[PDB]
Amino acid sequence: SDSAINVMKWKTVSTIFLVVVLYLIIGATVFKALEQPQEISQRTTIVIQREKFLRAHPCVSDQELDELIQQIVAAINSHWDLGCSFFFAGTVITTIGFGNISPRTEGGKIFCIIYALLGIPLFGFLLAGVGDQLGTIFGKGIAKVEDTFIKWNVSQTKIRIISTIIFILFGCVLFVALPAVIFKHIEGWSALDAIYFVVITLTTIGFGDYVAGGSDIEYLDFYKPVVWFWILVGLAYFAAVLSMIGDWLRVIAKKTKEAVGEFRAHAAEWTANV
Amino acid sequence: SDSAINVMKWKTVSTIFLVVVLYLIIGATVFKALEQPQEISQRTTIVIQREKFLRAHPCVSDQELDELIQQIVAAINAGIIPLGASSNQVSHWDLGCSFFFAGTVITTIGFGNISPRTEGGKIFCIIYALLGIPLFGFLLAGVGDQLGTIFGKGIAKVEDTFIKWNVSQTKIRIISTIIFILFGCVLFVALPAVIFKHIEGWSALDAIYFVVITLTTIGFGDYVAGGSDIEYLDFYKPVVWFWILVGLAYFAAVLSMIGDWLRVIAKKTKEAVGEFRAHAAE
């Protein structure tokens, strides 16, 4: 009766694996449908202005312009002053590896390995302590409004649902809405790009297409410090939200398992009623 | 649920915060010393080839050569191959790459080599991440549970064999954890680095560099397996997906162990300064 638990474990893992595979298949087709047509437009614009630059500059040779493009690309393969190396050290221990700057000295790659293996756990302790502090702050606030609801409202199991909505709306305004407003003004980004950056950063995905403080424009003395502070409390908030979404998925997984139970049981007595 | 414990918790957070700032300061200075000479040297060489192209083409407005470079670089962010010899460009958002891109999202290994530029694609990317990340966490937990029981069965075979001469109290736990490290290193780090060096044509260090940056979910994007335009063995990208699956589970356990070690050493250092704070030069 001990291998039976392992078989039931495998049964759970294999169905979750298939669901994840389905998730990747659906997402792939959607990202294809959304991003492929746009890719057509910008690759026609590079070929028109390529030949246009040849046309606009007939002195430039075809053979000598293609030789220039390759070493530009080869060059893509100060960026390391104390400010950026500090920021880079942050992108490592937070796993938000934006990658806009990354070590290419083979000594720098060795240190990057050592720095990450010790940095990730150490920063995890900090992120846990900040989340614990933010948890108690919201706890008193949510406890006060709980005790106001118990007065007019009769029974519980409903106040927790209301309370979780406050956590989202406040957390969205504090950690998503407000910094996105400042990001669009300071960084000159679109409103959607600001939300896009906020979520991509706080989920630790860190694509690198958008980086606050990354462009070489003038920045106020307090700006990057408060963004560091936003990173700290923001990662704690998104960690709780992602865990809550996971808890919702666990409930939906049981309701769907129960829903499919009611369905085939009904369809069984009907095929029997034949 | 408040009281005195919250004050003692806050005191710990502030010391860890200061230590993290120190960690960031020390790391910044080290990366400064290592990476600054290489970037200064090669940016003087680009100015050498700058002026060479500047002199060779006076018809080019020279100040307008940066005007061409900006639209090259801005188009490189979308990933273009603008050569008359290679005017046949293959898709970066085919079903294979969009599958790979969806993986880099839900695993948070956001390599970023390709990223959505359609404003609709960014909205979907937000929804895809907010639901995908928690869902993939369940899979990664199940894989870690599977690897845990396999290592459990493996360690179970030797469990009753350990009853030998020198029967131990607290020492047998350390031995088993050493097998977990060395075995796990060859399976999930050393061996895939070997294949990465052969198939992808990377250096031995770059293969290890890629493995750790990928399996820690940092994902810089300077190294991506299967990203370069090689034919690939057809089995390659599937088996790399499997390495990603069990590799992320393994590195999760290793990172948590390092944190447990850091908790022990933090108390040893806290006690070491304690005997120091009391003695004050005998």
Ligand SMILES: CCCCCCCCCCCCC/C=C/[C@@H](O)[C@H](CO)NC(=O)CCCCCCCCCCCCCCC
């Ligand atoms: C460090 C700052 C100075 C910058 C430049 C110094 C070179 C880097 C220091 C590594 C040891 C020097 C000896 C030869 C090194 C090179 O051949 C090179 C190392 O990247 N490749 C190897 O395969 C090394 C052959 C050994 C084969 C074992 C596996 C290869 C892993 C790379 C070295 C160990 C990494 C340690 C990670 C925990």
Ligand SMILES: *[C@@H]1CC(=O)N(c2ccc(C(=O)NCc3ccc(Cl)cc3Cl)cc2)C1=O
């Ligand atoms: C090198 C050029 C440059 O300006 N740069 C840089 C420095 C500092 C920051 C920064 O502090 N961004 C805010 C921040 C802090 C921490 C984390 Cl984990 C993320 C973010 Cl967005 C950005 C860029 C260089 O790298």
Ligand SMILES: *[C@@H]1CC(=O)N(c2ccc(C(=O)NCc3ccc(Cl)cc3Cl)cc2)C1=O
């Ligand atoms: C578009 C061009 C291309 O070749 N490409 C691509 C496709 C597939 C992979 C890949 O599978 N890499 C292994 C892998 C799988 C999953 C995760 Cl999360 C990471 C990694 Cl390294 C790479 C590149 C394009 O994007």
Ligand SMILES: CCCCCCCCCCCCCCCC
């Ligand atoms: C598909 C068969 C499920 C039988 C296993 C017992 C139900 C519990 C499944 C809920 C998710 C697994 C554990 C949660 C991960 C921390």
Ligand SMILES: CCCCCCCCCCCCCCCC
């Ligand atoms: C953790 C506190 C560090 C303060 C922020 C440093 C970020 C990188 C340095 C760049 C300039 C310093 C702050 C000026 C804001 C633009």
Ligand SMILES: CCCCCCCCCCCCCCCC
């Ligand atoms: C508890 C609220 C935190 C919100 C602060 C995050 C702002 C992100 C960008 C920093 C801009 C500096 C000016 C903001 C002044 C409040």
Ligand SMILES: CCCCCCCCCCCCCCCC
């Ligand atoms: C690494 C350098 C960080 C830049 C230091 C500025 C931090 C926040 C600005 C504080 C302004 C000082 C005036 C006092 C009023 C708050």
Ligand SMILES: CCCCCCCCCCCCCCCC
């Ligand atoms: C424990 C076995 C797996 C059962 C999973 C139930 C369905 C999967 C969850 C649904 C995925 C996202 C739904 C959000 C609405 C589109």
Ligand SMILES: CCCCCCCCCCCCCCCC
């Ligand atoms: C994955 C994209 C949206 C979610 C809808 C499809 C999820 C797969 C449904 C599988 C149903 C099986 C439930 C398990 C109980 C027997």
Ligand SMILES: CCCCCCCCCCCCCCCC
């Ligand atoms: C996915 C159905 C099986 C193969 C059908 C051909 C679709 C595209 C050809 C090669 C791409 C394989 C799909 C990449 C992601 C699994």
Ligand SMILES: CCCCCCCCCCCCCCCC
């Ligand atoms: C295929 C792009 C142009 C076709 C005509 C316009 C359709 C609307 C744009 C496609 C979806 C992006 C916006 C959706 C975000 C709410």
Ligand SMILES: CCCCCCCCCCCCCCCC
């Ligand atoms: C050391 C044995 C532990 C189990 C891990 C081996 C993978 C197979 C799991 C057993 C369930 C049968 C698999 C179903 C066929 C794909």
Ligand SMILES: CCCCCCCCCCCCCCCC
């Ligand atoms: C059929 C040839 C595969 C090459 C296509 C590139 C994408 C890789 C497809 C593998 C997908 C299965 C792994 C899913 C594990 C979560």
Ligand SMILES: CCCCCCCCCCCCCCCC
């Ligand atoms: C051994 C657990 C003691 C309880 C400490 C309260 C929770 C904080 C976690 C560990 C305290 C700092 C660890 C040092 C980080 C390197």
Ligand SMILES: CCCCCCCCCCCCCCCC
């Ligand atoms: C709760 C007290 C703060 C914990 C201080 C951490 C001590 C770490 C000692 C240094 C050991 C070398 C590892 C690098 C630092 C984590």
Ligand SMILES: CCCCCCCCCCCCCCCC
């Ligand atoms: C890479 C090393 C970074 C940090 C190295 C040590 C930092 C501070 C450790 C000593 C602090 C003693 C705490 C005692 C509190 C009572």
